[PDB]
Write a protein that binds this ligand. Structure first.
Ligand SMILES: [Zn+2]
Ligand SMILES: [Zn+2]
Ligand SMILES: [Zn+2]
Lengths: 215, 10
């Protein structure tokens, strides 16, 4: 049938409506089947079950500015919360494009996991992906390149080997053992479980946690 | 409680 095991694909999180880089692990039946996929860089989530609807062949082809026509549904990067920043990958129908001397302006209606979002100013016009349509093209069986996702930091430049205090631990600057990296519900700064002067031994089951700076 | 691993998917 359609998608095979080991095949690299994109899994759409029905909640936020975004597409994530994943890989098929198993395929069961209830084209009405269940896809058990694992996310490349989300091991803490393990295997996840997906409807055939929320699974497509891994994106690979980039549509450059010149070939972007209005009314063309594609997959681009957008950050609904911080539009001026890099976000995640959603489906969108390009509404209009406007090129001047200072910038190529791309506008599209970003589709989310509940309802559309009309007339969004797409920042990354060079990173537009063509949606692989079921059947057309070959299956992705070889480990492909990585799309850049998640907001970037202008203090360490997202360089893994660099210690930061804005995107990493507000205290030391490390970036390891991230599931123990408490995040204050006030200044959004990260604090390791084992860094602040009474080192906590576990995760505060309490919904909120306000760091020392914020009491 | 929000850990950096949890708040990833905004
Ligand atoms: Zn940083
Ligand atoms: Zn630390
Ligand atoms: Zn704080």
């Amino acid at each position: 049938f359609l998608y095979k095991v080991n095949e690299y694909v994109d899994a759409r999180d029905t909640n936020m409506g975004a597409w994530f880089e994943a890989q098929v692990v198993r395929v069961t039946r209830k084209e009405d089947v269940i896809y058990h996929v694992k996310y490349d860089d989300y091991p803490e989530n393990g295997v996840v079950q997906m409807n055939s609807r929320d699974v497509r062949a891994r994106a690979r082809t980039i549509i450059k500015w010149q070939d972007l026509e209005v009314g063309q549904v594609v997959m681009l990067n957008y950050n609904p919360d911080n539009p001026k920043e890099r976000g995640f990958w959603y489906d969108a129908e390009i509404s209009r494009k406007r090129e001047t001397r200072t910038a190529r302006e791309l506008y599209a209606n970003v589709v989310l996991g509940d309802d559309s979002l009309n007339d969004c100013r797409i920042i990354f016009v060079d990173e537009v992906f063509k949606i692989e349509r079921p059947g057309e093209g070959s299956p992705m069986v070889d480990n492909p390149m990585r799309r850049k996702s998640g907001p970037s930091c202008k203090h360490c430049k997202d360089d893994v080997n660099r210690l930061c205090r804005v995107c990493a631990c507000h205290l030391c600057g490390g970036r390891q053992d991230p599931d123990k990296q408490l995040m204050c519900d006030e200044c959004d700064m990260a604090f390791h479980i084992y860094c602040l002067d009474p080192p906590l031994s576990s995760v505060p089951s309490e919904d909120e946690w306000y760091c020392p700076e914020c009491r | 409680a929000r850990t950096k691993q949890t708040a990833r998917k905004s």
